[PDB]
Structure 1
Amino acid sequence: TLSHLRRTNTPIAKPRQLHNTHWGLVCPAETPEGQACGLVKNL
């Protein structure tokens, strides 16, 4: 439940890559496999 409430989605150059700037803001690990991997993020 906590994890669902803290979720993030990104519709649609490289967007599923964990990105430098993400440090501090989005969890580096938590993310679904395949399908929407890297698109669905978790604060």
Structure 2
Amino acid sequence: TLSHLRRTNTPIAKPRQLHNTHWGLVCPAETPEGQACGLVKNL
């Protein structure tokens, strides 16, 4: 429940890849798998 409450959705040049700007603002490893892997992120 807690992780579902902190969820991001990015509709759709390399958004899926973990970015340096994401450090400390997005969890590095929590993401959906297969489809929309990295498109959806957890704060």
Q: TM-score, normalised by structure 2?
A: 0.96
Give aligned-pair identity as a percent.
100
Structure 1 residue matching 2:3: 3-state secondary structure: helix
- Runs of 5+ in structure 2 lacking a partner? none
Q: TM-score, normalised by structure 1?
A: 0.96
Give the Cα separation in 2 of the matches to 1:6 and 1:21.
18
Runs of 4+ aligned structure 1 residues displaced above 4 Å come to none
